Each structure stands twice: as C-alpha cells, then as structure tokens.
From a paper:
A related group of proteins with a similar Mn/Fe cofactor is termed R2-like ligand-binding oxidases (R2lox). Following O2 activation, their cofactor catalyzes a two-electron redox reaction which results in the formation of a tyrosine–valine ether cross-link in the protein. The tyrosine and valine residues are conserved in the R2lox group, and the cross-link was observed in both R2lox proteins that have been structurally characterized. Both proteins also comprise a hydrophobic channel leading to the metal cofactor wherein a long-chain fatty acid molecule is found, which coordinates at the Mn/Fe ions of the cofactor. The mixed-metal cofactor in R2lox self-assembles with the manganese ion in metal-binding site 1 and the iron ion in site 2 if both MnII and FeII are available.
Author numbering:
A (entry chain A): 3 to 286
B (entry chain B): 3 to 250, 263 to 286
C-alpha cells in the first residue's frame, strides 16, 4: 500500500541531484536509433572478407547482451528506491531505463542492417563474460527485491554502474573508436556509440551518487565498495584478455585498413577505467 | 540468471505490436514539462477567490497522486513481462514509465508555480479514492512479483490501464477541458493535459493488447475481466460522486462521461 504521495503533500525536491540529472537526461537524451542511417554500414560489412567480418562481432556480441542485461536488470534498483520513497531517483531511473532500451535497439538494428541478425553471437561470450552478465549482475540486482540494505545497494551499483558501465562499456566505446573510427568503417554504428557514450555519463553519475550517499552514512561501506570492485576484476580482465586474444588471431582487418591496433594500450585503458571508478568514490 | 539474450541469438521482433507502439512512443513522446510556461496559471490562480481556489484543488489532488502511484506501480508489470522474455513489451514499458514521470513532474510544477506546493492536498482523497490508489492498484501490481499467472496479469492491467487510466484519467482530462478551457483559465496546465492525453492513448493500447492476448488463450478470462471491472466501479463512482458534490458547469454530463469511458473500455475487449 501507499501511505501517501510526495507530490500531494508537497512537491518534487527540485534541488535533488537526481532531479537535476533527470532534467539533463530529458534535454540530452532525445536521439532515436530509428533515425541512424546504417546503409553505409551494410556496404562496409559486405565489402569485408568472411575473416574481416568476424573481427568486429565479438565486441558487438558483448554490447548487445550487455544492453539487454542492463535493460532488464535495472528494474529491481528502481523498485527498491521507489519503496524507500526516493521519488527523484525513480524519475531519473525512468530515463536510465529508456536509454538502455534504445541501446538494445541500436545494436539490434545494426545487426539486422548488416545481415547478421540471424547469426547467434553467443559464441563470443566466454566463461568470464557469463560470470558477470549471465550471473553476477542479475544476482546482485534481484537481491534488492528482498534485501535493500546499504550493503546490497552498494553491491548492485558497483557491479552495474562501476564495473559493467564504468569499466567495461566505457572501454568498449574507446575500443570501437580506436579501431573502427580510425579505419573509417561503420559510421552508423559509431554515431550510435557516441550517443551511448553520452547517455552512459549519466548512468555512471547515478552510480556514483548512490554509492557515495551510502558511504556518507558509514565509512565502513567504502571498504565494501573497494572489495566488490576487486572481486569482479578477474572476470573483467579475463573477458578483456579473451577479446584481445581473439583480435590478435584475426589480423586481416587491421592489415587491410593499415591500423596498428595497440592491444596493450586497450588493456591499459581497462585498468585505467577500473581505477578511475574506484577513485570517484571518497571515504568521506 | 540469464539463459541467453534475444538480441545476441537473434534480433528484436520488429513486427511485434509493442515494438510498433514503442516506436510511436519515441516519435510522439518528445514533450518536456520543463518547457511549459506556467506564469499565467499563477496569475489566474491568484485572481480567484478563496472559494474558487479550493474548487480547483480536488481534481489536481486526484491527478498528482494518481501519476505518482502509476509511476511506482508500473515497475512490477515491467518485471513480470521481462521475466517472461517479452522484450518488446519491456522496451515499450520504458516509454510508459518515462511518460508517467513527466506526468508527475507536470502537475507538481503546476502546484509549485501557482503557489500551493506547500499545501497538503490529501484532504481531497476520500475513502473510495484511497481504495483504488492507495490499496487496490499497488496490491494488484505488486502481486506480479510472486504470481504472474494470466489471472493476475489481467487483474493488474484491468485496474491500472482500464480503470485508473481508461476510465478515471480520461474522464479527468475531459473534466479539465470542460471547466477551465471554456473559462480561459490555466493555459499551461491545459497544454500539459493535452500532452498527457496523447501519452495516455498508448498506455491504454498496452492494456488492451495485454488483456486481449490473455483472453485469446481462453474465454474464461473474458469473464474475469468484466468481473474485475465491475468490482472497481463502486469506488470509481464513489470518487466521482464525491468530486461532483464538492463542485455543488454541467456536473451530470461529466458523471456520464465516466460511465461512457467505463463501458467503452469493456467494449474494447473481445470475448473471442
Ligand atoms: C580488445 C579490448 C577489450 C575492451 C573491452 C570491451 C568490452 C565490451 C563491452 C561489452 C559490455 C557492454 C555493457 C553495456 C552497459 C550499459 O549500456 O549500461
Ligand atoms: C467531476 C467529474 C469527475 C471526473 C473524473 C475525475 C477523476 C480524476 C483523475 C485522477 C486519477 C488520474 C490517474 C492517473 C493515471 C495515468 O495518468 O496513467
Ligand atoms: Fe548504461
Ligand atoms: Fe498513464
Ligand atoms: Mn580464465
Ligand atoms: Mn461512499
Ligand atoms: Mn547502455
Ligand atoms: Mn499519466
């Protein structure tokens, strides 16, 4: 039951950081995946050899499942904050959810347009990827239906916003640009990547706000955060190593397009992102 | 756990009715409550007598609580459909949820602008309103976390989409236009109502689609729909009567519009 309603007894808290983020989302999130022109992407894909064609799919496979996972797995967070009466957070989470729906749609339209919609891309999820996206992420979010303690909320935000989004998605955006933007390939996809990357900034800021407000109540939670980050790292780097090793074995795309794909710089960016995320949370 | 992902094994079902409605929501859902100019609404409200001021509040009280209730109480429906693998429904429900947030925002911005944000409008919720919005609606949706059976889904969609939205919300939009548009009062608010009414068409289409696809499996479910509609009518009309009595504008025309919406919603569901 509802005991009352905030906007009947009072108003929205207009100065709440999440209401301000919600207003930014409305202003900055108007893009529509249906408006992206993928016609040149289709031509680029068909111009590639079977061997070059496969070079690009592992990354798209990771994103496509990732967007879908987070579309579904953000609902428990919105439920738990709704039950705590955090209306401004809930308002913002509606934009977060609608962003992720558009992200799922974007990568699925690209797959459809380039002619791989019928291909099962699951073969590029190794065991580390599944640990995070098939298991740890849904376990941490679904927990919130029965356990919305600060410990549970920190853990959900950490897996979802600081690892999945703040570490893996950010490094994927960077990787796309280092490879495909340099090569001049897939302009529709990269347009979408740029929209995603802009949306993502708000998603990570929600996670920072959520973790920090819990850490502000009791310093002890800061060490929970750092520990949950470190618990997930081996799967992060285990997925990244797997992508890196696939890429090192399919060098035709880089040759054809004259790219020196520094896979060690990419791996260093993942490590940098991970430690950046850790540092955006303060003990006090 | 996730067994796999539809957009990795395959793609979105591009032809699915709820993917189509999602596409229409993105195209038609761009409005922003923050762009509405409420400055004249403030002047209009200040120029009313104390008695005319309090005449306006009950309806706004009903809407502001109602938008907040549906923003929160749609989440179990999104979860239950997500859990059933209905990805296109979920994509649509993200637009549904973001619409209701903008609706909460619009009425709260209006209360703030005209200077009643500090006032507690709960006094204008009678027992019948609380039965629907404080109790029956969250009960029926929250049930879906543990019981997503066809019977529970039809009950949730009936209470939410056919009664709260299809009967009360539609009637309230009609009421606002009949009273205030003929009076040249609250033009910001009425612009917001026009946007809300456009959004609400899709929300009702979702409810119809949901109830009808469950009825198509078994006609027994048609009779459950009609029964649950009738179960709620006494509270719908109890609330409408309470509002009508406060106003005492052709109030019997409004009252009959509510009955007209109620029967229209029944008719939009086919036994077969
Ligand atoms: C070759 C270097 C590897 C770089 C690492 C790339 C990681 C791929 C990204 C897949 C996960 C995407 C998750 C989306 C999350 C969201 O939208 O919130
Ligand atoms: C005086 C005649 C009475 C007319 C009926 C007025 C009913 C007021 C409406 C309040 C409930 C609004 C529910 C919001 C649901 C939504 O927008 O999805
Ligand atoms: Fe995200
Ligand atoms: Fe609605
Ligand atoms: Mn390993
Ligand atoms: Mn009564
Ligand atoms: Mn995303
Ligand atoms: Mn509404």
């Amino acid at each position: 039951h509802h005991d009352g309603f905030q906007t009947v007894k009072a108003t929205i808290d207009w100065e709440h950081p999440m209401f301000k983020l919600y207003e930014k989302a409305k202003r900055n999130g108007k893009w529509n995946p249906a408006d992206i022109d993928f016609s040149q992407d289709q031509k680029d894909f068909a111009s590639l050899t079977s061997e070059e064609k496969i070079s690009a799919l592992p990354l798209v496979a990771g994103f496509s499942a990732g967007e879908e996972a987070v579309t579904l797995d953000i609902l428990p967070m919105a439920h738990a904050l709704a039950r705590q009466g955090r209306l401004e957070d809930v308002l913002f989470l509606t934009t977060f959810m609608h962003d992720e729906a558009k992200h799922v749609e974007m990568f699925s339209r690209w797959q459809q347009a380039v002619g791989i919609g019928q291909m099962d891309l699951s073969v590029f999820h190794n065991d580390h990827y599944k640990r995070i996206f098939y298991e740890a992420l849904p376990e941490a979010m679904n927990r919130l239906y029965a356990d919305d303690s600060p410990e549970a909320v920190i853990r959900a935000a950490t897996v979802f916003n600081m690892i999945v989004e703040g570490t893996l998605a950010e490094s994927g955006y960077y990787t796309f640009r280092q490879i495909y933007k340099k090569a001049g390939l897939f302009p529709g996809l990269l347009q979408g990547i740029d929209y995603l990357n802009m949306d993502e900034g708000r998603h990570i800021q929600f996670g920072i706000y959520t973790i920090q407000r819990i850490v502000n109540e009791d310093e002890r939670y800061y060490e929970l955060f750092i520990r949950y980050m470190d618990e997930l790292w081996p799967h992060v780097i285990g997925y990244v190593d797997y992508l890196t090793e696939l890429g090192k074995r399919q060098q035709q795309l880089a040759r054809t397009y004259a790219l020196e794909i520094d896979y060690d710089l990419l791996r260093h960016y993942v490590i940098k992102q991970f430690n950046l995320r850790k540092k955006q949370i303060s003990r006090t």
